Short mmCIF file of C-alpha atoms and ligand atoms in Angstrom, two decimals:
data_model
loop_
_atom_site.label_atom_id
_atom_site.label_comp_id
_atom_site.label_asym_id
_atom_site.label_seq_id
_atom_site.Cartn_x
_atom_site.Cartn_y
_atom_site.Cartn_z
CA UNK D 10 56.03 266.04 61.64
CA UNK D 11 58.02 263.10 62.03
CA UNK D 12 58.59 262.87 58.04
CA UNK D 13 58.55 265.94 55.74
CA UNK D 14 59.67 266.41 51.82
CA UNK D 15 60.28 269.51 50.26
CA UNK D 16 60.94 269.54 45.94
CA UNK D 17 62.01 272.60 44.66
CA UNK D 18 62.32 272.92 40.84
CA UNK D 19 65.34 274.58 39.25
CA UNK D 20 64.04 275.65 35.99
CA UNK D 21 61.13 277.78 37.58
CA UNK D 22 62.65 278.97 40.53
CA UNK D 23 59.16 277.57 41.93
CA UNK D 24 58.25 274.76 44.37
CA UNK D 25 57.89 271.69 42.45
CA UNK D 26 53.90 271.17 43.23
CA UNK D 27 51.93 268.31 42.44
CA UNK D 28 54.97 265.74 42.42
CA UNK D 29 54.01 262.25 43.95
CA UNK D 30 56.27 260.57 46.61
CA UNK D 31 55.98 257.10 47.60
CA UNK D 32 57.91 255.58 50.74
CA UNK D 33 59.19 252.20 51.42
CA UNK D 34 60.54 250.55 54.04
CA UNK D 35 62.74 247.34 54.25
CA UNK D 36 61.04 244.36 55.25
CA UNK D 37 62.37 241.18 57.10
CA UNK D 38 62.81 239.73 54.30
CA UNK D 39 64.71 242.41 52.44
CA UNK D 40 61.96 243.10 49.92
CA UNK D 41 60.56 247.03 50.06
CA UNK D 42 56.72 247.49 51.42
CA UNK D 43 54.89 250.04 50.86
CA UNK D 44 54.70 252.49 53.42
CA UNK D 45 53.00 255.93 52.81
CA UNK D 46 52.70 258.26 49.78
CA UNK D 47 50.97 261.35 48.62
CA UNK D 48 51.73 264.41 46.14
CA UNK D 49 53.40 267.83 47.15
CA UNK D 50 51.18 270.99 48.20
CA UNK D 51 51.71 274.81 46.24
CA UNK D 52 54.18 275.12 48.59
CA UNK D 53 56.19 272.02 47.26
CA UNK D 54 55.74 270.41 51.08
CA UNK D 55 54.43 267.27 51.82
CA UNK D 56 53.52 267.01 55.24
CA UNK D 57 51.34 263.59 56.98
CA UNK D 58 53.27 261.03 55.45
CA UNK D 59 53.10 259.63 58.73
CA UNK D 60 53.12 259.39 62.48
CA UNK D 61 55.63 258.77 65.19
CA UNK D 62 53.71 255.13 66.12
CA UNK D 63 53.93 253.97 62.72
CA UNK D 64 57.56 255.25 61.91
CA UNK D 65 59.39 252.79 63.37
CA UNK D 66 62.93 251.81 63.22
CA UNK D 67 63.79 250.93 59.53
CA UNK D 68 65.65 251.39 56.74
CA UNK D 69 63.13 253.69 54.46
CA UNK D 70 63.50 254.39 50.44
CA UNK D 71 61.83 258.03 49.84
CA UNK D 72 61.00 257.58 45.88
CA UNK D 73 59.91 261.48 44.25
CA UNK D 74 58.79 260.75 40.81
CA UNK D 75 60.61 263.52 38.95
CA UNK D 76 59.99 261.67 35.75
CA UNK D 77 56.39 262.18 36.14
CA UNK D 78 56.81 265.72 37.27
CA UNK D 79 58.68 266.82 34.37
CA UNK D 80 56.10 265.15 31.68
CA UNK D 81 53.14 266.46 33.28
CA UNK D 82 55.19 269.79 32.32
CA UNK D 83 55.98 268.94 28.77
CA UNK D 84 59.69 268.31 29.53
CA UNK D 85 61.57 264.81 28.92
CA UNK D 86 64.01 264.22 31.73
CA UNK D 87 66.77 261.86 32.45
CA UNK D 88 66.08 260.18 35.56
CA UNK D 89 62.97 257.79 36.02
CA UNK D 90 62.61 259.03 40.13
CA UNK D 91 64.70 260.78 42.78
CA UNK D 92 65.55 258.10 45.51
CA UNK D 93 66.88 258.78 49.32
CA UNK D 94 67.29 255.87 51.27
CA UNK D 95 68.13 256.27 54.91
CA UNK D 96 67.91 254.20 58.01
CA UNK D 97 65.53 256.28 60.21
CA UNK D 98 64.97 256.57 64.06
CA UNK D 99 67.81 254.07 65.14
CA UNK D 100 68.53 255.85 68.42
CA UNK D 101 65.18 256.87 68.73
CA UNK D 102 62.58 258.62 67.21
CA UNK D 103 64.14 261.93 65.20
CA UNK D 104 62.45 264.33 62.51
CA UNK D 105 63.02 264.05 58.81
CA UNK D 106 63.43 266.43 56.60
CA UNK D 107 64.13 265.25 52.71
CA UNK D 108 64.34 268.04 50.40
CA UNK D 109 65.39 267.92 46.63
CA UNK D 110 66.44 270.67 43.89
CA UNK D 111 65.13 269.52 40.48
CA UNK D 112 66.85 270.11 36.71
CA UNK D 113 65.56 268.34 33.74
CA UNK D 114 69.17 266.52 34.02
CA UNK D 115 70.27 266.80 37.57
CA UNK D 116 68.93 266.31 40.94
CA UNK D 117 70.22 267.27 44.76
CA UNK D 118 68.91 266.20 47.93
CA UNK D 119 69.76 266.61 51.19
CA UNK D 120 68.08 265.77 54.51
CA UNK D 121 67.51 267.62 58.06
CA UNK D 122 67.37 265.67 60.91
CA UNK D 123 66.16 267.02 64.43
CA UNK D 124 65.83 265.21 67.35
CA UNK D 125 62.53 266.57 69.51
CA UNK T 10 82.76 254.03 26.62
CA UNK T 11 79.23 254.10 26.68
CA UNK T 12 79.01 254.50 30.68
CA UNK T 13 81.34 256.57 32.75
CA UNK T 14 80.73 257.03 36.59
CA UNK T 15 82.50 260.18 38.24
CA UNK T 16 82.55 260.60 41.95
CA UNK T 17 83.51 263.61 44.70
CA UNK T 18 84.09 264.43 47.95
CA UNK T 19 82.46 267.57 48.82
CA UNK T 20 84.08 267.32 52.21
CA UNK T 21 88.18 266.76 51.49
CA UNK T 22 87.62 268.05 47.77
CA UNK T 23 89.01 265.31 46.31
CA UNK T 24 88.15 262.34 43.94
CA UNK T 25 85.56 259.42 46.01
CA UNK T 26 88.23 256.79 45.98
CA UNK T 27 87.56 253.00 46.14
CA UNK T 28 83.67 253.68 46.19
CA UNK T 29 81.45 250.35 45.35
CA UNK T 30 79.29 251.48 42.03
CA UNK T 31 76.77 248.59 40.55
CA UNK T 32 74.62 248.69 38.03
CA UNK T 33 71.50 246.65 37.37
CA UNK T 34 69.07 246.91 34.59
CA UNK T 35 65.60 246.38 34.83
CA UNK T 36 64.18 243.09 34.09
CA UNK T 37 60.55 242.03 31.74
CA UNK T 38 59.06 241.17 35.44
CA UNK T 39 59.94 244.53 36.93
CA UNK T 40 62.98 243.03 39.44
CA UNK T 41 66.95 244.52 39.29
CA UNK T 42 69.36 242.26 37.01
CA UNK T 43 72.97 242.83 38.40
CA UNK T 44 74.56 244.11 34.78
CA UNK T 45 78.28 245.68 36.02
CA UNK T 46 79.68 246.93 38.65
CA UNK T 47 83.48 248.23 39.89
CA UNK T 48 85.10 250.87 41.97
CA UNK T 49 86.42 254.02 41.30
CA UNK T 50 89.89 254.67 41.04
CA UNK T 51 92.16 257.29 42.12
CA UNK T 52 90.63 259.91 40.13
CA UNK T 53 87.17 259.05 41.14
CA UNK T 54 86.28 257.44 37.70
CA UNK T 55 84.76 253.99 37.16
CA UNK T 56 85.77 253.24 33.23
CA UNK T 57 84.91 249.67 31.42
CA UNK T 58 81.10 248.92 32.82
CA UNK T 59 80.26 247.94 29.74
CA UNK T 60 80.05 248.26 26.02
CA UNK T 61 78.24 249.26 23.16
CA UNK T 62 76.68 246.11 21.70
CA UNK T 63 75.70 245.27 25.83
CA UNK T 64 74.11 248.48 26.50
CA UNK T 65 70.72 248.83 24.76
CA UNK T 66 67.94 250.57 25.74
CA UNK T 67 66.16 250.45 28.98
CA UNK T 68 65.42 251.50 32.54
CA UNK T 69 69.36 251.04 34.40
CA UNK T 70 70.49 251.79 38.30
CA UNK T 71 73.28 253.12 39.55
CA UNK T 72 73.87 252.51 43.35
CA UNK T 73 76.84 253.82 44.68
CA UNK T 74 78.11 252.34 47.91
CA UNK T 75 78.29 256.04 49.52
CA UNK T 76 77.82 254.79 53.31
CA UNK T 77 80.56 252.21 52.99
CA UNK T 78 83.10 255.34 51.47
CA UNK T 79 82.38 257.48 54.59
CA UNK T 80 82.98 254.81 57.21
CA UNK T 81 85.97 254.10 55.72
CA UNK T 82 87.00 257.84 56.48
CA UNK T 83 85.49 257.47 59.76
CA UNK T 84 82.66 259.59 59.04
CA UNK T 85 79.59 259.13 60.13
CA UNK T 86 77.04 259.24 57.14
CA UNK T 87 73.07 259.56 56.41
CA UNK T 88 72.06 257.04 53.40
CA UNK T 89 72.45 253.83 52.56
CA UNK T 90 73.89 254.24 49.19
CA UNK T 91 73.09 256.91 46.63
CA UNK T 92 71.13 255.96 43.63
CA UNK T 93 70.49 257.07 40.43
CA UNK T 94 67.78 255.51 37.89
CA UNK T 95 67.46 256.53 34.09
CA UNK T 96 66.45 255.65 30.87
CA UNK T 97 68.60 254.45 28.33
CA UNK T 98 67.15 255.97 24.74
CA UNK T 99 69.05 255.43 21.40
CA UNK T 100 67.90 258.79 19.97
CA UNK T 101 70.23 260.58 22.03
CA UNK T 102 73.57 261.41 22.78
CA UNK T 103 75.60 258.01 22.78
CA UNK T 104 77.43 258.68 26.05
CA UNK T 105 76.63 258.46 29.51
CA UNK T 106 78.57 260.40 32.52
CA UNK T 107 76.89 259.80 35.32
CA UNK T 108 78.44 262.11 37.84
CA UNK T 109 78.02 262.14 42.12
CA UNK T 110 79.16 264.77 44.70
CA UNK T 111 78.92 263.47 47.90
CA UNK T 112 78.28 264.82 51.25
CA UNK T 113 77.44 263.42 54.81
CA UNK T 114 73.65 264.43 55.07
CA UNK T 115 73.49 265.20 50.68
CA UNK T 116 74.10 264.19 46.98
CA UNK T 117 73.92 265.89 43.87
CA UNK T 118 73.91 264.16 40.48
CA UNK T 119 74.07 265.00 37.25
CA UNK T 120 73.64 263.22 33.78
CA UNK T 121 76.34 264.62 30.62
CA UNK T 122 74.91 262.80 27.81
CA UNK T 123 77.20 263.62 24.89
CA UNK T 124 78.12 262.33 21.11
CA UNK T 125 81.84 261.82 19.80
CA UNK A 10 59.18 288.95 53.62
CA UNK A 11 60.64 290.21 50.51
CA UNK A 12 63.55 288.95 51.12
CA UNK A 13 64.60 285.76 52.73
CA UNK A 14 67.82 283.61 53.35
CA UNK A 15 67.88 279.70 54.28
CA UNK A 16 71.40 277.70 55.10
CA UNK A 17 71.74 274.23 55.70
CA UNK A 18 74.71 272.21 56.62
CA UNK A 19 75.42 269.36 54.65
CA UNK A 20 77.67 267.61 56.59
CA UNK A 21 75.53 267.86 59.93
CA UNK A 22 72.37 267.23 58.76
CA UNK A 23 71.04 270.86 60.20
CA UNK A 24 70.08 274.30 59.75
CA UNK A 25 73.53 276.17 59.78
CA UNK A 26 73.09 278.33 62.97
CA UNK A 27 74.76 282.16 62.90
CA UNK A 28 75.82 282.19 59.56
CA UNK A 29 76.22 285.93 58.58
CA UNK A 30 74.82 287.65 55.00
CA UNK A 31 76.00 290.43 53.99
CA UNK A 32 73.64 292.05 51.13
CA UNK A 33 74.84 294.79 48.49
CA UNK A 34 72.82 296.99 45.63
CA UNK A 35 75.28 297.74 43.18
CA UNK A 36 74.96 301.43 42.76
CA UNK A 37 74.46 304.07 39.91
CA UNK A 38 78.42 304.31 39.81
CA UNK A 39 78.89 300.22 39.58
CA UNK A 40 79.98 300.34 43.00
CA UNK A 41 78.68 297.87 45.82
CA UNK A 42 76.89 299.51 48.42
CA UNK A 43 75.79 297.73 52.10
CA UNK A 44 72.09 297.51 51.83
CA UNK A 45 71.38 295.16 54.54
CA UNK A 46 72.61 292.29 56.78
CA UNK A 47 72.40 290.05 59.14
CA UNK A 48 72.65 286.43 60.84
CA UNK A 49 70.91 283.24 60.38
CA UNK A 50 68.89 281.90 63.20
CA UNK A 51 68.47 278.53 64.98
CA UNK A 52 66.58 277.59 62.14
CA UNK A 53 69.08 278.83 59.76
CA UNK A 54 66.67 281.48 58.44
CA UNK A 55 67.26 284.94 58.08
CA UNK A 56 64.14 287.33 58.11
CA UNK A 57 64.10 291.18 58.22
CA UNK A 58 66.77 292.14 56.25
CA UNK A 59 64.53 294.89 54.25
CA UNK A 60 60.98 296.16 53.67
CA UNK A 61 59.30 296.26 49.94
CA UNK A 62 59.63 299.76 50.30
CA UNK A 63 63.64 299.72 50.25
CA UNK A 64 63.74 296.89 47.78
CA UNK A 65 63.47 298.48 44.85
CA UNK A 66 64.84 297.39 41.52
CA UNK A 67 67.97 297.02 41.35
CA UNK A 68 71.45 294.07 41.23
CA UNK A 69 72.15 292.85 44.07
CA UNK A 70 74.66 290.26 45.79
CA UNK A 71 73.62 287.94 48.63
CA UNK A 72 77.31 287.35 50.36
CA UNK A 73 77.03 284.15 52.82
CA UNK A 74 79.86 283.94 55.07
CA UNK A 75 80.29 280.23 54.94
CA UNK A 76 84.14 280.75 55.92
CA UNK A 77 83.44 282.56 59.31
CA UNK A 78 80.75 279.47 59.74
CA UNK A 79 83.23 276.81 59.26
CA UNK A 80 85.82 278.26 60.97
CA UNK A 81 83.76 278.89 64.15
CA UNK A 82 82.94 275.08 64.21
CA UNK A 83 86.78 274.52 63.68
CA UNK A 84 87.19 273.20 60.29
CA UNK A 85 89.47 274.66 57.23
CA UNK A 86 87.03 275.50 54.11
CA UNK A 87 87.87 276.24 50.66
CA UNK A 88 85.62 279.24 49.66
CA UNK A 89 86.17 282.38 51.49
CA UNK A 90 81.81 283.10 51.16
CA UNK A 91 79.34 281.60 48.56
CA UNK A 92 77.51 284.47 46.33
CA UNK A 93 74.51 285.37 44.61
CA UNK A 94 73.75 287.78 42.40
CA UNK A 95 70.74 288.70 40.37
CA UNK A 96 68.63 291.66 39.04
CA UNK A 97 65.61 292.27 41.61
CA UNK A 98 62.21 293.38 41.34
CA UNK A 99 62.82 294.63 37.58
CA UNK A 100 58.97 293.30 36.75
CA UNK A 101 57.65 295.14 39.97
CA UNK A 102 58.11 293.69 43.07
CA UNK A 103 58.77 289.55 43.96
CA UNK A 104 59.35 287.68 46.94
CA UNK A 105 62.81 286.13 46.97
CA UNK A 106 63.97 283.16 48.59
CA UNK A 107 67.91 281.98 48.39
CA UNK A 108 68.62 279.17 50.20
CA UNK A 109 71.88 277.85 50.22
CA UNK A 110 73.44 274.12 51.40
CA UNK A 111 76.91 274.22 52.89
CA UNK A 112 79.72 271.36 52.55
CA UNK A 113 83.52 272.34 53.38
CA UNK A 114 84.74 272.35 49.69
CA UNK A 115 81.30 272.98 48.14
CA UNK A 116 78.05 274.87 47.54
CA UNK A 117 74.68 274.88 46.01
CA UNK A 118 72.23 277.68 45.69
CA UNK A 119 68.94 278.18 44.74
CA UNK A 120 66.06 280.65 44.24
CA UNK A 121 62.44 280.60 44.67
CA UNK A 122 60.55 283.54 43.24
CA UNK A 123 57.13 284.01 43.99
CA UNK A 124 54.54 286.93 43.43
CA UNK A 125 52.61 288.92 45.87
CA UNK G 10 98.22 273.26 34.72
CA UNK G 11 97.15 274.99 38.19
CA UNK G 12 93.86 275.79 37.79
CA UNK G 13 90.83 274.43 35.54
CA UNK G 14 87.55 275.30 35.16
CA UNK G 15 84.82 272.97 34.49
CA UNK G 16 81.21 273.90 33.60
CA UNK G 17 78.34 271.90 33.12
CA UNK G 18 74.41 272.30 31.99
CA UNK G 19 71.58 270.97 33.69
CA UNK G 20 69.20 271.41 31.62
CA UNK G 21 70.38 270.36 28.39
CA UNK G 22 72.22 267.33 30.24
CA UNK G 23 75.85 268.98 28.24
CA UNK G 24 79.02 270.87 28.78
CA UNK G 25 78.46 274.15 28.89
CA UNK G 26 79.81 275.36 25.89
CA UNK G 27 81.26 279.04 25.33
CA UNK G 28 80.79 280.21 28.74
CA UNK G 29 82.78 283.52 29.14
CA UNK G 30 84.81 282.90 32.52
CA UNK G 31 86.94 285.90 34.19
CA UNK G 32 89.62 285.17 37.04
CA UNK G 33 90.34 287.86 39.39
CA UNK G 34 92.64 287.98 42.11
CA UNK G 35 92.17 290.10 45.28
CA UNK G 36 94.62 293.10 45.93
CA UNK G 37 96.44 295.21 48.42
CA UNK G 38 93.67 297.56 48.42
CA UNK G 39 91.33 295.06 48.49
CA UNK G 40 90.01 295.87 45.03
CA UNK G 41 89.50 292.61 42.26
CA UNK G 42 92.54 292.91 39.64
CA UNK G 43 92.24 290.84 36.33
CA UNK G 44 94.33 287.84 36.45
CA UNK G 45 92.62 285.29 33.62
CA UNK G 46 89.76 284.85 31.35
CA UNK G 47 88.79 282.47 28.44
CA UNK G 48 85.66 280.59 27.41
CA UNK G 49 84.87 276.92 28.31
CA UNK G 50 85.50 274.81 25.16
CA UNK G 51 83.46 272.16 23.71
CA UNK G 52 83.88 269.63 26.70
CA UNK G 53 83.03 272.50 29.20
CA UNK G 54 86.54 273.29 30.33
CA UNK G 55 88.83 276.12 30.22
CA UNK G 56 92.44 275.04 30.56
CA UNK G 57 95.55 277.34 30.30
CA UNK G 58 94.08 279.85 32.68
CA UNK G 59 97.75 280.31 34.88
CA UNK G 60 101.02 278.68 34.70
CA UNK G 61 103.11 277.61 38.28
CA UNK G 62 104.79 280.48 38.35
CA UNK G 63 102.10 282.97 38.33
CA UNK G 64 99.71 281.01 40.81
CA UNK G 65 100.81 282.34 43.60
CA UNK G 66 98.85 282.06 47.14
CA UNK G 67 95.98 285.03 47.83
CA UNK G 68 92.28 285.08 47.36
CA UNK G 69 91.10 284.72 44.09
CA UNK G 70 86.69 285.24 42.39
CA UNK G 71 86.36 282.68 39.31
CA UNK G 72 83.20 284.56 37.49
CA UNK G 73 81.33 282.45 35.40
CA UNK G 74 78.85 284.80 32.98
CA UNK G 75 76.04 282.19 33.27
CA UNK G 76 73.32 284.73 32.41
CA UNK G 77 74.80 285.10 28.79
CA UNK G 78 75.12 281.15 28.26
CA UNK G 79 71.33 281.00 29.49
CA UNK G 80 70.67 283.85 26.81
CA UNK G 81 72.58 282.52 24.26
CA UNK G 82 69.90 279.40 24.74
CA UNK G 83 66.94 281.19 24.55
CA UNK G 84 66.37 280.76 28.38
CA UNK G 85 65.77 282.91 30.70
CA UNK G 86 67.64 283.14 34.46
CA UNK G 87 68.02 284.41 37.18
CA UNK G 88 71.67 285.01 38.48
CA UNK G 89 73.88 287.75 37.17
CA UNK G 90 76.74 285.56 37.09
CA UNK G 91 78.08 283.11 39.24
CA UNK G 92 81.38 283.51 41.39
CA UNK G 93 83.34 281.24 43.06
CA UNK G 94 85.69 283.08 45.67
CA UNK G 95 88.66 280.77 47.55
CA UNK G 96 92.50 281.06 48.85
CA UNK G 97 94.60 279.27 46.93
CA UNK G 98 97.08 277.94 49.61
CA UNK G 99 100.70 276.52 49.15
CA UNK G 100 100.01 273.96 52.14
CA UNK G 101 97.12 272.10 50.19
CA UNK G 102 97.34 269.74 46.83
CA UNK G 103 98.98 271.65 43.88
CA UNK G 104 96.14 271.40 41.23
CA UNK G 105 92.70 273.08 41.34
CA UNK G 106 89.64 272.27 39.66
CA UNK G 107 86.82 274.59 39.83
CA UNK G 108 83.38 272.91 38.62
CA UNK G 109 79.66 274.15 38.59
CA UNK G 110 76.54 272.87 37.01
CA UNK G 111 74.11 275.42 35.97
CA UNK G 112 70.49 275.55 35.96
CA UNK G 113 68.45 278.74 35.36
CA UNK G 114 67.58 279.31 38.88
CA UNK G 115 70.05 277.21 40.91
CA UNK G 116 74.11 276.37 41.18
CA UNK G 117 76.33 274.41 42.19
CA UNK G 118 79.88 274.30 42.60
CA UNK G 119 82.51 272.33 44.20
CA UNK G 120 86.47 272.82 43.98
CA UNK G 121 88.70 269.43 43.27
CA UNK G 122 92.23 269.46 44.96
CA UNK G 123 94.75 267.15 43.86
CA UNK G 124 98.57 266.46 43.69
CA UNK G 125 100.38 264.76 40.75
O1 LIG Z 1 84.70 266.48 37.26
C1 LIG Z 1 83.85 266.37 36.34
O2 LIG Z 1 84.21 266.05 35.17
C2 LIG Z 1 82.38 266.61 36.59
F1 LIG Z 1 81.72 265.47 36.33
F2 LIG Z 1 82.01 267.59 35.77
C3 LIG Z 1 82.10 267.02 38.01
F3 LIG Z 1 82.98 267.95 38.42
F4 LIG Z 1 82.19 265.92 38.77
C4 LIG Z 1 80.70 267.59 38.11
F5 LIG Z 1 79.85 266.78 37.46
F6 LIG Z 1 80.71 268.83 37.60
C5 LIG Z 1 80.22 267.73 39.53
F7 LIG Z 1 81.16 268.45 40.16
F8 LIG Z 1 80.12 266.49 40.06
C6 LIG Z 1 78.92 268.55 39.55
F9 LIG Z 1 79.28 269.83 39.66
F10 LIG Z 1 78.17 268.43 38.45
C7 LIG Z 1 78.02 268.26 40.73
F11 LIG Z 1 78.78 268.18 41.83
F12 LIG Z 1 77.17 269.30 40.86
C8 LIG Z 1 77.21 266.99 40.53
F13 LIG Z 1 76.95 266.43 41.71
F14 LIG Z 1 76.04 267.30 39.97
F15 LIG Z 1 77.88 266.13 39.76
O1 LIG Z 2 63.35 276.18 51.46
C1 LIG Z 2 63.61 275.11 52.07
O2 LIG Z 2 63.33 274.99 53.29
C2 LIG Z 2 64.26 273.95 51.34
F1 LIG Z 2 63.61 273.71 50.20
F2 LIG Z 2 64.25 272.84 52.09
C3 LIG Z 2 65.68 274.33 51.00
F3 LIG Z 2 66.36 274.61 52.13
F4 LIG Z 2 65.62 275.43 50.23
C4 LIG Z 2 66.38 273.21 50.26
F5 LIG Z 2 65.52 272.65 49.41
F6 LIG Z 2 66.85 272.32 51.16
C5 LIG Z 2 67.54 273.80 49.49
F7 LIG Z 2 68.47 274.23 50.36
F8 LIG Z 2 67.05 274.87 48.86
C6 LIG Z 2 68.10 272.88 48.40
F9 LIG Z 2 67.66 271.61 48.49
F10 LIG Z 2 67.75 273.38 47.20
C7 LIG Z 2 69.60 272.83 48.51
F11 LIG Z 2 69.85 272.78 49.82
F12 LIG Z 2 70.07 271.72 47.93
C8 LIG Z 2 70.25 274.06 47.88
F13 LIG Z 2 71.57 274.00 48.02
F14 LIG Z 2 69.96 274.15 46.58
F15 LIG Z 2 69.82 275.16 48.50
NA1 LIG Z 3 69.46 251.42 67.95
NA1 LIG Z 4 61.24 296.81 34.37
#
């Protein structure tokens, strides 16, 4: 999968399922366009974001709405979203990994990147 | 001190030093206002952003310039910047640390919301 | 698998290869017996350490070797291994999950706890 | 002042407040001899753990009794404890923070290393 995200919640010890992620990606003209979304599995994965044709060269704003997450769950966080933004696939197409640990207050992410 | 930014090196152990930090607040049509910005000083701390009259409630950003930081230590880095979005809510605490730990490939964040 | 271990590498961007665990049970005289180890793999997993019918109840302590990692890729860390420990199985048995993500002066750890 | 601890709550968004923390340093025989304890005031930090004089190099386990905080809360968790283990060496800078942020299932920790 050429892009993968993984949420993990903190609280639970669970994955975080049912959180929506939405993906942007620069434009020429420096505004962000829409470029894929969908909600994590029971596993906390979200897998066919996209495909190697369409996941160009970019730079590419991974958006997890923890805010969301958290109120569906009866809890009032801090943060409105998680955000990662990376440039992807500049010396050629590589895998993405973006995973994130969440806490009502706090947030890490970190990302795995393989080349196939 | 309504806002305090805090920001480490997971990789020396150290303070971030010199890192870029803005902060926008979200406007009525949905678009970024630059609000204040500065960079961190010696012990990783960004002081003075703004004050209490100036900082009402609403949705804020805090990028920090983490890409620029780690080519400045020759490092070669994964994101863009590192970002962290929140609501500002009069009800609580009436001070904000927003505090970063940085690493090549990850960032954690946290939120200390506090009263004198 | 009862009992699983995941290690990333935070300043690569990777699974963190041949990372060794060392697990303990801590034992009727508060002592810290071996109970099981082992290395991570290429995909920084480590599978097989025991069978649900050795992993009884019990406290026990996940010990990654992250020094013995960064040292074998030629860098100085600050912690000499990063630790877990928690009570097991004490509402019959659970799957256990502890990842862990690796930078040179830090750690973070989590836990995800499912049932069979 | 050599060494600080700093603790921090990622839940509540606060320092964690009268944490129970227990520095040990390693011996001859291997064994973990007493060397400082306290409990993290109302900013989260324990100061006045070890003077110059008695920081000497060796290997050193900070244990932070997180499962009493969570407790304490009403909130239940899953580690023990949490340890941070680390050489203190005369080569590096002279002052040593130890922080972590807690969350019932998940923690992270990073060590600060500064000179005057
Ligand atoms: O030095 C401080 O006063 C501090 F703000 F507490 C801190 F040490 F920076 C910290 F917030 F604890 C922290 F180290 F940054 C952290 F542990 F919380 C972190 F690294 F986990 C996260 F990234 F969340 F800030
Ligand atoms: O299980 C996975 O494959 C995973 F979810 F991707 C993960 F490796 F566990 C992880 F999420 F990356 C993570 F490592 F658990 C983490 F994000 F929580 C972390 F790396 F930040 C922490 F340090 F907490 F383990
Ligand atoms: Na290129
Ligand atoms: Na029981």
């Amino acid at each position: 999968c050429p892009l993968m995200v993984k949420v993990l919640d903190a609280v639970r010890g669970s994955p975080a399922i049912n959180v929506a992620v939405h993906v942007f990606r620069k434009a020429a003209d420096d505004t962000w366009e829409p470029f894929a979304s969908g909600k994590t599995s029971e596993s906390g994965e979200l897998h066919g974001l996209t495909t190697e044709e369409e996941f160009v060269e970019g730079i590419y704003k991974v958006e997890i709405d923890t805010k969301s997450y958290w109120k569906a769950l009866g809890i009032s966080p801090f943060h409105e979203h998680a955000e990662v933004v990376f440039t992807a696939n500049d010396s050629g197409p590589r895998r993405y990994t973006i995973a994130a640990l969440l806490s009502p207050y706090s947030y890490s992410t970190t990302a795995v990147v393989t080349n196939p």
